UniProtKB/Swiss-Prot annotation:
<dbReference type="GO" id="GO:0009055">
    <property type="term" value="F:electron transfer activity"/>
</dbReference>
<keyword id="KW-0963">Cytoplasm</keyword>
<dbReference type="GO" id="GO:0043448">
    <property type="term" value="P:alkane catabolic process"/>
</dbReference>
<comment type="function">
    <text>Rubredoxin is a small nonheme, iron protein lacking acid-labile sulfide. Its single Fe, chelated to 4 Cys, functions as an electron acceptor and may also stabilize the conformation of the molecule.</text>
</comment>
<keyword id="KW-0291">Formylation</keyword>
<dbReference type="InterPro" id="IPR018527">
    <property type="entry name" value="Rubredoxin_Fe_BS"/>
</dbReference>
<dbReference type="GO" id="GO:0005737">
    <property type="term" value="C:cytoplasm"/>
</dbReference>
<dbReference type="Pfam" id="PF00301">
    <property type="entry name" value="Rubredoxin"/>
</dbReference>
<keyword id="KW-0408">Iron</keyword>
<feature type="domain" description="Rubredoxin-like">
    <location>
        <begin position="1"/>
        <end position="45"/>
    </location>
</feature>
<feature type="binding site">
    <location>
        <position position="32"/>
    </location>
    <ligand>
        <name>Fe cation</name>
    </ligand>
</feature>
<feature type="binding site">
    <location>
        <position position="9"/>
    </location>
    <ligand>
        <name>Fe cation</name>
    </ligand>
</feature>
<protein>
    <recommendedName>
        <fullName>Rubredoxin-1</fullName>
    </recommendedName>
</protein>
<dbReference type="InterPro" id="IPR050526">
    <property type="entry name" value="Rubredoxin_ET"/>
</dbReference>
<dbReference type="GO" id="GO:0005506">
    <property type="term" value="F:iron ion binding"/>
</dbReference>
<comment type="similarity">
    <text>Belongs to the rubredoxin family.</text>
</comment>
<feature type="binding site">
    <location>
        <position position="35"/>
    </location>
    <ligand>
        <name>Fe cation</name>
    </ligand>
</feature>
Length: 45
């Protein structure tokens, strides 16, 4: 399962912690729960 990390605050998106929803399937209006940036500010781990 592909993890992503927020460029700005280091928050880690692990799909297993979000009912197995892959990062790429998140809505375009999702944002980092810590700092509020869009999905554009994430990088794959
Ligand atoms: C995460 C951080 C800040 C947000 C978020 C999410 O908004 C999610 C819902 O967005 C709906 C589309 O945008 C509505 C208005 O956007 C401009 C102001 O948004 C406030 C911050 O929203
Ligand atoms: Fe963040
Ligand atoms: Na991968
Ligand atoms: Na974790
Ligand atoms: Na938060
Ligand atoms: Na926005
Ligand atoms: Na990477």
């Amino acid at each position: 399962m592909q993890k992503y990390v927020c460029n700005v605050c280091g928050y880690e998106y692990d799909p297993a912690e979000h009912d197995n929803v892959p990062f790429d399937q998140l809505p375009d209006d999702w944002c980092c729960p810590v700092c509020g940036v869009s999905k554009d500010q994430f990088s794959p781990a």
